[PDB]
Amino acid sequence: VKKLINSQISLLIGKGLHEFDSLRDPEVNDFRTKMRQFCEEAAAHRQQLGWVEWLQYSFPLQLEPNRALLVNVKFEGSEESFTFQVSTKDMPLALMACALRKKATVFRQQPEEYALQVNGRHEYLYGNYPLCHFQYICSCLHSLTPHLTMVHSSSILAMRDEQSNWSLEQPFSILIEGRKVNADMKLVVQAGLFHGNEMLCKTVSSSECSEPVWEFDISVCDLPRMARLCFALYAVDCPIAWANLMLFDYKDQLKTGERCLYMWPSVLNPAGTVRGNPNTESAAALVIYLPEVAPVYFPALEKILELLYEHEKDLVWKMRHEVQEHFPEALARLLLVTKWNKHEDVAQMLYLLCSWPELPVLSALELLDFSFPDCYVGSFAIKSLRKLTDDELFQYLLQLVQVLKYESYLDCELTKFLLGRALANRKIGHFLFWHLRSEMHVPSVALRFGLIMEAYCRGSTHHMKVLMKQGEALSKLKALNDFVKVSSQKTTKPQTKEMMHMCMRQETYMEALSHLQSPLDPSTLLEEVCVEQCTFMDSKMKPLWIMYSSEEAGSAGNVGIIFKNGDDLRQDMLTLQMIQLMDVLWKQEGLDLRMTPYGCLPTGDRTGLIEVVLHSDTIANIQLNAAFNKDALLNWLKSKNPGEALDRAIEEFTLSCAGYCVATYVLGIGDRHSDNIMIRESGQLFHIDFGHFLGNVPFILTYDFVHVIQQGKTNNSEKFERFRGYCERAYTILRRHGLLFLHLFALMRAAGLPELSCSKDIQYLKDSLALGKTEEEALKHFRVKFNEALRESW
Numbered sequence: 186v187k188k189l190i191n192s193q194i195s196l197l198i199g200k201g202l203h204e205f206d207s208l209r210d211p212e213v214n215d216f217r218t219k220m221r222q223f224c225e226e227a228a229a230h231r232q233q234l235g236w237v238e239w240l241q242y243s244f245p246l247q248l249e250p251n252r253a254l255l256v257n258v259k260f261e262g263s264e265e266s267f268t269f270q271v272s273t274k275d276m277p278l279a280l281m282a283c284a285l286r287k288k289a290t291v292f293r294q295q296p297e298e299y300a301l302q303v304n305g306r307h308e309y310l311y312g313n314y315p316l317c318h319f320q321y322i323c324s325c326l327h328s329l330t331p332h333l334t335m336v337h338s339s340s341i342l343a344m345r346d347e348q349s350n351w352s353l354e355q356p357f358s359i360l361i362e363g364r365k366v367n368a369d370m371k372l373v374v375q376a377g378l379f380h381g382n383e384m385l386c387k388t389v390s391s392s393e394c395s396e397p398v399w400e401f402d403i404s405v406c407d408l409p410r411m412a413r414l415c416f417a418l419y420a421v422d423c424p425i426a427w428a429n430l431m432l433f434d435y436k437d438q439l440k441t442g443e444r445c446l447y448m449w450p451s452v453l454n455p456a457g458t459v460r461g462n463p464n465t466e467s468a469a470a471l472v473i474y475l476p477e478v479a480p481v482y483f484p485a486l487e488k489i490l491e492l493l494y495e496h497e498k499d500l501v502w503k504m505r506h507e508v509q510e511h512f513p514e515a516l517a518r519l520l521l522v523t524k525w526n527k528h529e530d531v532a533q534m535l536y537l538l539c540s541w542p543e544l545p546v547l548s549a550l551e552l553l554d555f556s557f558p559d560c561y562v563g564s565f566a567i568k569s570l571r572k573l574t575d576d577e578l579f580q581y582l583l584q585l586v587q588v589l590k591y592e593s594y595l596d597c598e599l600t601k602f603l604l605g606r607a608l609a610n611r612k613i614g615h616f617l618f619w620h621l622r623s624e625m626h627v628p629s630v631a632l633r634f635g636l637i638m639e640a641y642c643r644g645s646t647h648h649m650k651v652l653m654k655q656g657e658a659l660s661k662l663k664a665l666n667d668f669v670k671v672s673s674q675k676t677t678k679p680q681t682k683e684m685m686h687m688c689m690r691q692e693t694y695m696e697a698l699s700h701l702q703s704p705l706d707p708s709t710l711l712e713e714v715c716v717e718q719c720t721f722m723d724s725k726m727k728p729l730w731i732m733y734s735s736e737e738a739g740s741a742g743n744v745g746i747i748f749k750n751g752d753d754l755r756q757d758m759l760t761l762q763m764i765q766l767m768d769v770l771w772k773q774e775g776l777d778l779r780m781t782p783y784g785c786l787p788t789g790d791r792t793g794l795i796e797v798v799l800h801s802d803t804i805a806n807i808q809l810n811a812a813f814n815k816d817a818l819l820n821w822l823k824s825k826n827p828g829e830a831l832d833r834a835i836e837e838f839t840l841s842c843a844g845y846c847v848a849t850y851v852l853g854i855g856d857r858h859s860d861n862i863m864i865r866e867s868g869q870l871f872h873i874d875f876g877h878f879l880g881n882v883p884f885i886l887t888y889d890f891v892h893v894i895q896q897g898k899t900n901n902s903e904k905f906e907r908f909r910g911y912c913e914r915a916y917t918i919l920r921r922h923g924l925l926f927l928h929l930f931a932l933m934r935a936a937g938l939p940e941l942s943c944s945k946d947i948q949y950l951k952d953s954l955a956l957g958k959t960e961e962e963a964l965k966h967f968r969v970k971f972n973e974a975l976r977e978s979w
């Protein structure tokens with residue numbers, strides 16, 4: 186029985202569980218047994234949760250950051266529906282008391298034993314929030330009458346049931362023979378002792394073949410708990426390989442004897458993995474002699490607690506106790522000023538960190554960076570992050586996963602936190618899965634991520650099968666995309682499109698591609714695949730256009746996905762999460778710049794999905810075709826928004842244009858052309874290919890857009906300066922939360938994105954957001970760039 190659950194886990198995570206045993210690793214084996222028990226205890230809690238408490242797990246609420254509304258409601262397993270007049274300020278129990286009052290009237294034959302399901306979707310409307318606050322009821326108002334289904338307590342409960350399962354003064358010292366080296370020239374081995382991005386002593390090098398055979402300025406007593414010994418083999422300068430090791434193991438014991446380090450290819454790297462290269466055969470190895478001291482374990486918290494300019498740093502350390510009292514948020518500045526190469530100074534800091542008050546989510550997000558590698562500093566950060574909302578945790582989930590790459594040991598406070606929250610929310614567990622599964626091709630992350638997904642599956646027997654279905658569809662889509670890629674080069678598009686449909690109509694494909702949850706959004710059910718409306722896009726990697734159509738949801742079941750294999754979808758995903766954050770921060774301060782942060786999620790090696798924005802078209806397609814090319818875009822909105830509807834559309838356009846003009850400027854999105862800018866029939870303007878960001882520069886205002894803002898008029902200052910305001914207001918909101926973007930962008934350095942690697946890339950975001958300058962000084966600097974963008978258009 187357990188052999189099947191294990192076979193499914195191996196297929197789902199794309200790594201056999203037998204591979205973990207073959208390592209015969211006490212660290213990997215201890216993680217597996219400990220985390221399985223943690224997840225099983227979490228899974229146990231869910232099978233006893235109340236019916237409203239389960240709805241909270243499986244279908245978390247989607248909420249936005251007086252007036253009337255017509256809504257059709259219908260009880261489960263009944264054709265008969267009822268349209269009722271409800272207020273936007275009315276709570277779901279009022280709709281449920283109206284639906285129950287109508288039911289008793291018609292059927293001749295308590296609303297608190299019910300929940301409203303967004304018909305044909307895995308989204309629910311529960312809790313004491315007015316109908317205006319729900320993402321669905323709110324979106325319908327701007328779109329469409331909301332279609333709801335009265336799901337009873339017994340129907341929600343039948344789901345959970347079905348979803349069941351030590352101080353030596355001697356100077357520190359290390360080098361035997363290093364096998365499998367490819368070079369011309371002499372080989373040297375440089376070695377530095379790091380505690381994050383900072384050094385603990387001088388970088389001692391080795392003496393200047395394919396199999397070459399061959400003292401640190403810090404004491405063995407002074408070595409911090411999280412000390413790294415970083416190596417680099419090079420030719421004497423052409424780099425060859427690098428390797429990192431923790432001087433203390435997971436059981437907190439000082440490393441002794443021989444160690445064979447399987448090095449990673451280059452062209453000292455502190456941020457790199459402390460674990461070796463998996464290609465034992467290919468990788469160049471460096472055998473080192475980690476010296477004897479005796480066993481020596483690191484002092485426990487009980488025994489440990491018992492113990493800016495150059496001159497400015499000395500002042501921060503003197504007033505360290507005053508920093509805990511007067512400036513607790515200044516913890517980061519104090520930790521940096523602490524000397525981690527002095528056990529006496531590093532112990533005094535822990536005595537202050539242990540009595541230190543909890544920090545806000547923003548201050549905790551900085552402490553998660555590689556500049557802060559201490560376990561107690563790390564545990565403090567996660568302890569402060571425990572106050573995160575499930576919706577807030579989701580907004581930063583991508584960045585927290587990247588920080589798992591900075592982790593020194595497999596069992597860590599972050600893995601526990603991320604897994605604990607994942608098992609508490611099916612939406613957080615869904616996305617954590619795909620953030621981990623999409624990096625299984627990467628050899629460095631492959632073990633950590635594999636073991637985390639296995640543990641989640643140990644505590645999600647049903648969700649494992651849900652994700653397996655998603656994973657089965659994505660396999661058929663790679664196989665189908667490969668056909669489209671081969672065939673496209675041989676025949677006419679209608680011939681390839683017809684060939685794709687025949688392939689899709691196969692039993693194997695129809696079964697796989699249908700009745701699954703969207704990997705981009707678990708609440709969107711990709712039901713019946715519309716083979717006739719499916720095709721492929723003309724871009725280099727021939728992306729797939731896969732249309733779906735649910736009957737139970739009507740128009741809401743008509744959804745589409747884009748499968749793209751060949752290119753990196755990470756930066757596009759990062760940019761869209763940053764635009765969604767912008768839209769949230771804007772809405773929080775009453776500014777809805779009607780944004781379209783469409784779904785984009787990487788699922789594999791150069792493989793991922795993109796949500797289809799229905800009823801949209803590229804600016805290039807509209808402009809290709811009006812007596813004047815400038816009038817094409819306005820005449821287009823006139824076609825889709827006739828009569829009194831045009832006025833709403835020009836406003837929708839302006840708002841979205843302002844938001845995207847700021848977003849593309851701030852994020853530094855270059856390569857802007859008519860083909861990677863889209864418009865929705867509602868008037869909403871959005872951007873699509875985010876291949877390049879952070880100036881890889883100035884504010885850009887297009888004349889074809891400035892014309893739509895001006896209501897088609899040559900001179901229209903009322904409407905154009907109203908737009909200038911939206912840009913100013915939106916840019917100043919982001920500036921206040923600039924520290925939030927800088928912290929998340931700092932954590933994303935772990936992703937290994939070519940366009941986000943150095944400190945110069947983060948400087949672009951400091952400059953665009955004019956971080957140093959005062960609000961007045963920064964609003965003027967933007968007013969110069971904006972006015973210059975206006976002159977730049979003819």
Ligand SMILES: CCC(=O)N1CC[C@H](Nc2ncnc3c2CN(c2cnc(OC)c(C(F)(F)F)c2)CC3)C1
Nearest residue numbers: 722724728730747749757795796797798801873874
């Ligand atoms: C089969 C109809 C057709 O060829 N179209 C072309 C223009 C238009 N494109 C879209 N229409 C509606 N929604 C979207 C799109 C295009 N989107 C999209 C966004 N990033 C991407 O890559 C990073 C890609 C892709 F190149 F990989 F495919 C597509 C966003 C969603 C429809």
